[PDB]
Amino acid sequence: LTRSEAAMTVLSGHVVVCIFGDVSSALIGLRNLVMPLRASNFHYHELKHIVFVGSIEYLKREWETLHNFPKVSILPGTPLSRADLRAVNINLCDMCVILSANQNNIDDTSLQDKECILASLNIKSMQFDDTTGVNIPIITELVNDTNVQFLDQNNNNNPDTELYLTQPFACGTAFAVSVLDSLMSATYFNDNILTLIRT
């Protein structure tokens, strides 16, 4: 989809997946994101149109396991572009996903989430004329727990607060990857927990 074509097509009530990929970047396996949204448990009208915003060179690598899905569209570009988000009608989306792709870099420790925080604040700072950017439902993947506290920039909280007490984590806006290690420990303590979570 071009910017003009995406703007022309009405695609409200959709799911935007904003990814940061490249030919050198490691594959994140986007199929595991689209499969739960494409379960037969939903009726066809229940299905949410999925639109990807990212580098097309990476999507071509990821496209082999994605073409067999019903309603998936791809808009080449970058998540940090404001016009790209305008065309997608990101103010009308059901959920906007910021994926911490390009993970193969280990630049410093917390600098890995620079792009995710930048894109999140960029979406939050938008204005629309028929609304604001704050009301847009956003889920952002972060790898450092402290970085989560950067999402609610307007609100002030103590630096000593735990990850789970922060507003972005409590509201479900920020997804921290440490929950997977916690799930691993829980699965060690009880094998059924992982089976239930996956099911």
Added chain:
Amino acid sequence: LVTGGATPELEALIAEENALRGGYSTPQTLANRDRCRVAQLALLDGPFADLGDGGCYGDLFCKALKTYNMLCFGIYRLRDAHLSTPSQCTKRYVITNPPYEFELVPTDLIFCLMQFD
């Protein structure tokens, strides 16, 4: 001074689309044109040729400000201007905010803010 009318709305428009956006001419558009540009004026050929013949800096500053509204930063002057011997060097150095009682070599340039016409 250096960028030229770096208003925040230009920042916003460049931020939105990462490109400059062409605009239709409007009275407001042509009004935003009226500004001041840095320029260098030569004493010999300009209207103030007489004031270049050793005249004071302040007199020419006042004459430019009163009539043409020209604010003179300073003098861009030949390196060998004070050399009594002839010299073919064309390198010139900068004098910032010269005093009022400054002699003006005829072969000098003046930094100024020229108004738009």
Added chain:
Amino acid sequence: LESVSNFLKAFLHKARDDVNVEIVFLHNISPNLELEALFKRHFTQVEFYQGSVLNPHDLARVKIESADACLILANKYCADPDAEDASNIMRVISIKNYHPKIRIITQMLQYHNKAHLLNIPSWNWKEGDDAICLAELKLGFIAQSCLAQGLSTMLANLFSMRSFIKIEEDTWQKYYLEGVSNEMYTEYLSSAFVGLSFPTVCELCFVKLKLLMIAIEYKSANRESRILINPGNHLKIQEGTLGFFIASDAKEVKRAFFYCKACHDDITDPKRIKKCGCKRSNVKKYDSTGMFHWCAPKEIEKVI
């Protein structure tokens, strides 16, 4: 070592009168021997601590909550300017999150990355937070030198501090130093100048007060404070306007704020003049704003 050396040689120049402020460096990399030696030379004004401003505990260690300001230096010689700019912006985000009311001066490699600063609501330009855009500023200096040779040298001498030197012999250095002795200052204009045109006030300030008035800050309600360079006859100075001058010293600038004629004589004696108590078809050729020339897009092959 290079960035610290440049920052220290510009910041800690001997001519500075405001000598009190202490510089505290915070970086996670252990300094090399040359950088340790450089810190040792300025041991009594420069301190170092190992940590990351991303880490809130490290921010608390350097007492950044009570720090006067935070200066963020940029890796100018980096493979990807965008990555460095994003890292610096995220550092700004961390510092603002720890303490929203702190002045931040950050260096930016690319011009288009400054927009992300708007994304931070705690970022305030009016409070004093600014972005030093290296590429924008340098190329603007070079372009304005293309308009007028030596303007870059003029401005560099204006905002920098240089050691005082006396040259007796008649050389071009004499006039160059008489020029560089000046510095660029700003001060509030006196109430006596309200209502006059800019040329009149500039002429009076230059002739009587020996201050070369550069610019005025224009205040309005619908539009924020805007800087005006050499306003013409039509504009009139309002109340409480900031003004940019070029003056030999900072003490010389105050004569603009304390000046009057209701108490000040017609004699050109600035010492005796200054008084503590006084008076009391349809083709588009321009951008959307029209501030720059604009042209229809052309392919690269056309201009090859």
